Structure 1
Amino acid sequence: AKQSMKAREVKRVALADKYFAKRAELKAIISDVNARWNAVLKLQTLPRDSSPSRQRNRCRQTGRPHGFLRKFGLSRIKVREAAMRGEIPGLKKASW
Protein backbone atom coordinates (compact mmCIF):
# COMPACT_ATOMS: atom_id res chain seq x y z
CA ALA A 1 0.00 0.00 0.00
CA LYS A 2 2.53 2.56 1.34
CA GLN A 3 -0.29 5.10 1.80
CA SER A 4 -0.04 5.03 5.60
CA MET A 5 3.77 5.23 5.65
CA LYS A 6 3.84 8.38 3.50
CA ALA A 7 0.96 10.00 5.42
CA ARG A 8 3.26 11.97 7.75
CA GLU A 9 1.74 15.35 6.86
CA VAL A 10 -1.85 14.05 6.91
CA LYS A 11 -2.06 14.22 10.72
CA ARG A 12 -0.05 17.44 11.13
CA VAL A 13 -2.47 20.16 9.94
CA ALA A 14 -5.79 18.36 10.53
CA LEU A 15 -6.58 18.63 14.26
CA ALA A 16 -6.49 22.45 14.29
CA ASP A 17 -9.01 22.74 11.41
CA LYS A 18 -11.70 24.48 13.50
CA TYR A 19 -9.62 25.37 16.56
CA PHE A 20 -9.32 29.09 15.73
CA ALA A 21 -12.12 30.03 13.29
CA LYS A 22 -14.63 30.74 16.08
CA ARG A 23 -12.04 31.50 18.79
CA ALA A 24 -9.95 34.34 17.32
CA GLU A 25 -12.79 36.88 17.39
CA LEU A 26 -13.78 36.08 20.99
CA LYS A 27 -10.23 35.50 22.30
CA ALA A 28 -8.39 38.17 20.30
CA ILE A 29 -6.58 39.30 23.46
CA ILE A 30 -5.03 35.85 23.92
CA SER A 31 -4.48 35.31 20.18
CA ASP A 32 -2.77 38.69 19.68
CA VAL A 33 0.34 39.57 21.69
CA ASN A 34 -0.23 42.55 23.99
CA ALA A 35 3.42 43.67 23.76
CA ARG A 36 5.46 39.32 25.05
CA TRP A 37 4.27 35.78 25.84
CA ASN A 38 7.78 34.34 25.91
CA ALA A 39 6.44 31.31 27.83
CA VAL A 40 2.87 30.74 26.61
CA LEU A 41 3.76 31.20 22.93
CA LYS A 42 6.71 28.80 23.31
CA LEU A 43 4.52 25.87 24.38
CA GLN A 44 4.53 24.78 20.73
CA THR A 45 8.07 23.49 21.33
CA LEU A 46 6.72 20.46 23.21
CA PRO A 47 4.91 18.92 20.17
CA ARG A 48 7.73 17.99 17.79
CA ASP A 49 5.60 16.01 15.32
CA SER A 50 2.49 18.14 14.63
CA SER A 51 2.02 21.92 14.59
CA PRO A 52 0.81 24.69 12.25
CA SER A 53 4.46 25.44 11.47
CA ARG A 54 4.91 21.81 10.33
CA GLN A 55 2.74 22.16 7.20
CA ARG A 56 4.54 20.28 4.42
CA ASN A 57 2.05 20.02 1.53
CA ARG A 58 0.20 16.84 2.52
CA CYS A 59 0.48 14.16 -0.18
CA ARG A 60 -0.52 10.64 0.82
CA GLN A 61 0.37 9.35 -2.67
CA THR A 62 4.11 9.96 -2.26
CA GLY A 63 4.65 11.73 1.07
CA ARG A 64 6.86 14.39 -0.48
CA PRO A 65 6.69 18.01 0.75
CA HIS A 66 5.39 19.14 -2.66
CA GLY A 67 1.97 19.31 -4.28
CA PHE A 68 -0.72 20.95 -2.15
CA LEU A 69 -3.12 23.88 -2.31
CA ARG A 70 -5.29 25.00 0.59
CA LYS A 71 -8.07 26.02 -1.81
CA PHE A 72 -8.74 22.49 -3.11
CA GLY A 73 -5.65 20.31 -2.55
CA LEU A 74 -5.25 19.63 -6.26
CA SER A 75 -2.22 18.55 -8.27
CA ARG A 76 0.07 21.18 -9.77
CA ILE A 77 2.88 19.03 -11.19
CA LYS A 78 1.16 15.63 -11.43
CA VAL A 79 -1.14 17.27 -14.01
CA ARG A 80 1.41 16.09 -16.58
CA GLU A 81 0.08 12.56 -16.01
CA ALA A 82 -3.47 13.67 -15.08
CA ALA A 83 -4.22 16.56 -17.44
CA MET A 84 -7.43 14.95 -18.74
CA ARG A 85 -9.05 14.48 -15.31
CA GLY A 86 -10.35 18.06 -15.29
CA GLU A 87 -8.87 18.96 -11.88
CA ILE A 88 -7.01 22.07 -13.11
CA PRO A 89 -8.93 25.27 -12.24
CA GLY A 90 -6.93 28.47 -11.95
CA LEU A 91 -3.52 26.82 -12.33
CA LYS A 92 -2.67 25.09 -15.61
CA LYS A 93 0.41 24.29 -17.67
CA ALA A 94 1.75 27.43 -19.32
CA SER A 95 1.77 26.62 -23.04
CA TRP A 96 -0.54 29.11 -24.81
Structure 2
Amino acid sequence: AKESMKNRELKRQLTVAKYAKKRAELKAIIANPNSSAEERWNAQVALQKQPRDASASRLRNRCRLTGRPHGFYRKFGLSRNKLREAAMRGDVPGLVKASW
Protein backbone atom coordinates (compact mmCIF):
# COMPACT_ATOMS: atom_id res chain seq x y z
CA ALA A 1 0.00 0.00 0.00
CA LYS A 2 2.70 2.43 -1.07
CA GLU A 3 1.97 5.52 -3.12
CA SER A 4 3.85 3.94 -6.02
CA MET A 5 1.74 0.78 -5.79
CA LYS A 6 -1.48 2.79 -6.10
CA ASN A 7 -0.12 4.89 -8.97
CA ARG A 8 1.17 1.92 -10.92
CA GLU A 9 -2.06 -0.04 -10.49
CA LEU A 10 -3.98 3.01 -11.67
CA LYS A 11 -1.72 2.58 -14.70
CA ARG A 12 -3.09 -0.93 -15.25
CA GLN A 13 -6.64 0.36 -14.84
CA LEU A 14 -6.09 3.14 -17.37
CA THR A 15 -4.44 0.93 -19.99
CA VAL A 16 -7.07 -1.81 -19.68
CA ALA A 17 -9.93 0.68 -19.89
CA LYS A 18 -8.38 2.56 -22.80
CA TYR A 19 -8.44 -0.29 -25.33
CA ALA A 20 -11.42 -2.26 -23.98
CA LYS A 21 -12.61 -3.38 -27.43
CA LYS A 22 -9.65 -4.62 -29.48
CA ARG A 23 -9.24 -7.51 -27.05
CA ALA A 24 -12.90 -8.37 -27.62
CA GLU A 25 -12.43 -8.18 -31.39
CA LEU A 26 -9.37 -10.43 -31.40
CA LYS A 27 -10.98 -12.95 -29.05
CA ALA A 28 -14.09 -13.01 -31.24
CA ILE A 29 -11.84 -13.72 -34.22
CA ILE A 30 -10.02 -16.50 -32.36
CA ALA A 31 -13.05 -18.13 -30.74
CA ASN A 32 -15.04 -18.21 -33.98
CA PRO A 33 -14.44 -21.66 -35.54
CA ASN A 34 -14.94 -20.69 -39.19
CA SER A 35 -12.16 -18.11 -39.22
CA SER A 36 -9.36 -19.93 -41.13
CA ALA A 37 -5.73 -20.09 -40.02
CA GLU A 38 -5.00 -17.15 -42.32
CA GLU A 39 -7.30 -14.90 -40.28
CA ARG A 40 -6.30 -16.58 -37.01
CA TRP A 41 -2.50 -16.20 -37.16
CA ASN A 42 -2.64 -12.47 -37.85
CA ALA A 43 -4.97 -12.10 -34.87
CA GLN A 44 -2.47 -14.06 -32.78
CA VAL A 45 0.31 -11.70 -33.83
CA ALA A 46 -1.91 -8.69 -33.12
CA LEU A 47 -2.62 -9.98 -29.62
CA GLN A 48 1.08 -10.67 -29.03
CA LYS A 49 2.38 -7.28 -30.17
CA GLN A 50 -0.21 -5.40 -28.12
CA PRO A 51 1.15 -4.32 -24.71
CA ARG A 52 0.90 -6.97 -22.01
CA ASP A 53 -0.31 -4.53 -19.34
CA ALA A 54 -3.80 -4.21 -20.83
CA SER A 55 -5.48 -7.37 -19.54
CA ALA A 56 -8.12 -8.17 -16.94
CA SER A 57 -5.85 -10.82 -15.40
CA ARG A 58 -3.26 -8.08 -14.80
CA LEU A 59 -5.56 -6.07 -12.51
CA ARG A 60 -5.63 -6.43 -8.72
CA ASN A 61 -8.38 -4.37 -7.12
CA ARG A 62 -7.32 -2.73 -3.85
CA CYS A 63 -8.99 -0.52 -1.26
CA ARG A 64 -9.93 2.89 -2.61
CA LEU A 65 -8.85 4.44 0.72
CA THR A 66 -5.49 2.80 1.51
CA GLY A 67 -4.79 0.26 -1.22
CA ARG A 68 -4.75 -2.91 0.86
CA PRO A 69 -4.77 -5.86 -1.59
CA HIS A 70 -6.08 -8.57 0.72
CA GLY A 71 -9.45 -8.41 2.43
CA PHE A 72 -11.55 -6.80 -0.30
CA TYR A 73 -15.35 -6.78 -0.60
CA ARG A 74 -16.45 -5.74 -4.08
CA LYS A 75 -19.93 -4.91 -2.77
CA PHE A 76 -18.21 -1.84 -1.34
CA GLY A 77 -14.92 -0.33 -2.44
CA LEU A 78 -13.43 -0.79 1.00
CA SER A 79 -10.86 -3.02 2.64
CA ARG A 80 -11.39 -5.53 5.44
CA ASN A 81 -11.11 -3.04 8.29
CA LYS A 82 -12.24 0.39 7.05
CA LEU A 83 -15.57 -1.31 6.43
CA ARG A 84 -15.84 -1.86 10.19
CA GLU A 85 -15.03 1.77 10.97
CA ALA A 86 -17.53 3.09 8.42
CA ALA A 87 -20.24 0.70 9.63
CA MET A 88 -19.75 1.58 13.29
CA ARG A 89 -19.78 5.29 12.50
CA GLY A 90 -23.01 4.66 10.59
CA ASP A 91 -21.88 5.85 7.16
CA VAL A 92 -22.76 2.59 5.37
CA PRO A 93 -26.52 2.66 4.63
CA GLY A 94 -28.70 -0.26 5.62
CA LEU A 95 -25.93 -2.12 7.46
CA VAL A 96 -26.52 -3.45 10.98
CA LYS A 97 -25.01 -6.18 13.12
CA ALA A 98 -26.94 -9.42 12.63
CA SER A 99 -27.74 -12.22 15.06
CA TRP A 100 -30.66 -14.28 13.64
TM-score computed with the length of structure 1 as normaliser: 0.50
Paired with 1:93 and 1:86, the residues of 2 have a C-alpha distance of 11
Structure 1 outlier segments of 4+, above 4 Å: none
Tell me if 1:15 matches 2:48.
no
Q: Give the number of the structure with larger relative contact order, counting CA–CA contacts within 8 Å between residues 6 or more apart.
A: 1
Pairs aligned (count): 85
- Find the structure with the greater CA-based Rg: 2
Q: TM-score, normalised by structure 2?
A: 0.49
Given that 1:56 and 1:65 are in contact with CA atoms closer than 8 Å, whether structure 2 keeps it comes out as no
Change (3 A) 1:93 1:15: farther
Task: Specify every segment of 5 or more residues in structure 2 that has no aligned partner in the other structure, as ranges.
Answer: none
Instruction: Determine the C-alpha separation between the residues in 2 that align with 1:30 and 1:41.
Output: 8
Pair 1:64-2:31 in alignment: no
> Where is the helix percentage greater, Structure 1 or Structure 2?
2
Q: Which consecutive unaligned segments of at least 5 residues does structure 1 have?
A: none
